[PDB]
Point group: D2
Chain length 243, copies 4
Amino acid sequence: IVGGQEAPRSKWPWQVSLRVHGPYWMHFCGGSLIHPQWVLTAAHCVGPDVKDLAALRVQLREQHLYYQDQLLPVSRIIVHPQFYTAQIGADIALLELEEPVKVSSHVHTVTLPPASETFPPGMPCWVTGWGDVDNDERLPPPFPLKQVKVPIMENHICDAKYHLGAYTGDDVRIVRDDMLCAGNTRRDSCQGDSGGPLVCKVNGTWLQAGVVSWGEGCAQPNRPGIYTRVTYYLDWIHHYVPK
Amino acid sequence: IVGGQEAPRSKWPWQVSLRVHGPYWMHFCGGSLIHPQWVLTAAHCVGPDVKDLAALRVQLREQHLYYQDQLLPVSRIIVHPQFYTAQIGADIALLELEEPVKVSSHVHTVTLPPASETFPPGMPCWVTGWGDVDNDERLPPPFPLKQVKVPIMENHICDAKYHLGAYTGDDVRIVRDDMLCAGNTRRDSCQGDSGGPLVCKVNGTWLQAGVVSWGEGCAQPNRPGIYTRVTYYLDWIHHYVP
Amino acid sequence: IVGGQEAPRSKWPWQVSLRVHGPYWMHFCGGSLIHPQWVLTAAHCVGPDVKDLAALRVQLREQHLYYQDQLLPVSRIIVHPQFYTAQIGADIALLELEEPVKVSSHVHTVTLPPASETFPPGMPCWVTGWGDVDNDERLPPPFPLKQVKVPIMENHICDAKYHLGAYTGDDVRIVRDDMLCAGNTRRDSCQGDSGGPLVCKVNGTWLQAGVVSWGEGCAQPNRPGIYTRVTYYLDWIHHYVP
Amino acid sequence: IVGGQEAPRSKWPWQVSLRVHGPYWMHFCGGSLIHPQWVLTAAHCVGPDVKDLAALRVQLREQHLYYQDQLLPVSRIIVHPQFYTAQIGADIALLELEEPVKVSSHVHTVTLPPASETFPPGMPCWVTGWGDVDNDERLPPPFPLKQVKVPIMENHICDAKYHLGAYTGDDVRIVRDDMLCAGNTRRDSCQGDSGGPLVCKVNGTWLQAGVVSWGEGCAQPNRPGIYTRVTYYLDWIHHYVPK
Ligand SMILES: C[Si](C)(O[Si](C)(C)c1cccc2sc(C(=O)N3CCC(c4cccc(CN)c4)CC3)cc12)c1cccc2sc(C(=O)N3CCC(c4cccc(CN)c4)CC3)cc12
Ligand SMILES: C[Si](C)(O[Si](C)(C)c1cccc2sc(C(=O)N3CCC(c4cccc(CN)c4)CC3)cc12)c1cccc2sc(C(=O)N3CCC(c4cccc(CN)c4)CC3)cc12
Ligand SMILES: [Cl-]
Ligand SMILES: [Cl-]
Ligand SMILES: [Cl-]
Ligand SMILES: [Cl-]
């Protein structure tokens, strides 16, 4: 997270950390708890190449990475089959947990938006994670969970912005219709936040609009953060995850 | 270049080296001389983002990098407008030099294929460059130009390989129709070779079948090297190059 | 710390962590509380070159680095005037804190040895720290304080080991009389542990026999860990610490 | 070499490059040809730990490293036995070549000074090598041999300078009597030059005053380059190398 600050302990009960087996269980991506037994994340965190399940675990909402871990095994990785790279899209995946978590005030699911939901431009949304605090700048120990408010932007503007300073034909799409953008040169998601949630409070209730997917660096001019658009993939999500 | 060997001095007179300004004018991509005033390379060497022309030079065929540089400034960078990333395609670009070079036995242009040539499996093809000699393994000084003969694989076969060990749906195409596959686990191009030429000998003439573009690593199982298919982009090249 | 294990919370209440200002206040050396206002450490952690005091803080005993820091500024750095490098000796220094700390069961001072104590082979001794767990192998988060029991080796035996596989003349002393050796190929201190304490239990009291100083790597054949011998430097410590 | 420039092809015929076996025969130290069959270099380049002879070769005077190598095997490494670290001193070693080289205008020995020779302060001497051109700044390809003029300084001043900005007692020696200093904040030897020659022209003839040994960085304030003082070790050198 660039330009944000440490989250209050009561906030973002759905945030999770995906961990890879090594000399320690290292954080490499975020995710969100969307059902007691399901984690939503970005496909690029776990593909397109097939990876070993035993070398992956999930950590639910932690204020500081690694201090008090209770790692949860994963029973299935479901990567969207249209996924090959973030820039082509379908950057979305599900992790089925081996047990349903017992939900609490501190740890609980985020609500997915209705298919019709549209998140208008300018809407103050929030993204959260434990990724880099700027380009090639790691989150320092003790690794607080961070949060930052980012405005939604219309795809047409986000796409037009990606073309400024680029050779790509202005009529050749860069930001695709299953993506969603947010952020500016002060507030952005960054490396290690991927997979985690962009959430917007609508009618006083938090909806997951986006899954952190990619961008050109972090908080660079004319290069907002790009997210997988959750509404786009509801039917695929609901193919596996109970309403 | 993975596998293969140092090129003889008389071979590949069209090979060039692209250099970026820094503590020294460092090699970062290949290219090929296709006209006295034009270099063909990969878009991803020079975009998608617009860069300062003054920080880019071209070196014509040299047997060892850096030892006898005579660097040439560029007047224009022309990047295929459909290009955004190499995994999508249109990984192709043209550099116009400030001056026409003088050609000779040692330095001269490569011939572009006719539009109908498909370069099928079993064609004798070579890729050349000063790139890595394996995954994360730099070419050692004195940086000789390397070559390796690489076997062409049909696109459909190459696409199906790229699906082994992947989540990607089989009907979701990875290797596109504007790409070409060549190489195996002993013979491939690698980082640093991008933008340079894959050339095949057809009726005694060397034709540039491809431009080194991408792959999943270098010389890995089921992941042949991927090239931009030059025939696909002839009309675009000919909007600029006589 | 190579070998060994995470320290229990009730052990080593004198352990401290030295921090350098940067993107975060990073741990770079150990130390030991020897008085409420004084930390004992290795010179090479803080010299030979004079550094800005404002860029240095001390953290008192903490079970995990960084998680609950309450950092303490330093008023003075006092470096043994004979110190230049750790291989020569006098690798010892004192930090005076701006305020006296408050002591307790969890945080309190270590006892310095009487001048006559020599710490012979077979004494039970432990070294503690948040340093590397092997050569070029960082302590992983969450950075627990580690301990390991290390066997003392007589200086003369340690010196002769340091000569095996070396050109250095046998009569040319490597391990000096103001140093102490402990450890083997399974149990040692390592980078990051420097300045912290080697403590041995004598008549029921923990005595600080050494300050972690140097070695040829960590836990390598014939290269035990080398420590500054605290008894040698008592008079100097007592010029400053009550 | 810091602050210098590429040497003329005719100069420094005695300079050599020591090479270590790896993915290529990489330069790690300089040396000087002091007899047809002997190379003088710094002990720290080859010790104090005993190293494998087969993984070491010598390259005589090359204008550019690696372009035209003709590597020479070494038959013996002789490290001064009083050597353990550069800061304690005796940082001096000999390499005996397996063959005497056939000497030419382009490649030939440097003359060692007489035991009595004293190189007065202020004397313009030269150091040469293929080391870093500043602190943590590698010599770029194509690796020209560089040269720089550095003045000799008296040990007492070099030692006094090392004490400025240091905790070390002013009466506790840093620069020892078998060492020699030269250079300033514009002109210095640096990493990878170690082992190579500091040469001074006396009575119109080149004498090797120094062997590049150590220092605190390169060309830093109050921290001149320290050299092993060749006159100090003549009798040891002549114990092995014919007059
Ligand atoms: C790792 Si990759 C080179 O692409 Si990028 C992820 C650097 C990339 C591609 C296109 C646009 C952007 S934009 C961007 C970026 O700036 N990032 C990543 C996203 C990140 C981020 C993260 C979260 C949130 C935000 C929003 N602020 C931003 C910020 C930094 C990275 C990118 C890559 C992608 C997909 C498939 C492959 S396969 C592959 C690969 O294995 N190689 C590269 C090709 C190479 C090769 C060269 C020549 C010849 C051959 C044939 N043998 C092979 C071998 C090695 C690399 C890739
Ligand atoms: C950085 Si240094 C060469 O010492 Si070392 C740490 C590599 C070292 C010297 C001698 C023996 C050992 S043994 C060892 C080691 O293996 N370590 C460090 C200790 C560590 C450790 C730590 C704690 C506990 C243990 C016990 N298990 C072990 C394990 C790893 C390191 C060493 C050094 C020491 C003292 C003064 C200086 S000044 C200096 C310096 O600035 N440079 C080196 C010289 C160089 C130079 C070259 C040519 C010409 C010039 C003139 N311009 C300058 C410039 C850069 C470096 C040093
Ligand atoms: Cl929209
Ligand atoms: Cl071949
Ligand atoms: Cl133990
Ligand atoms: Cl003198």
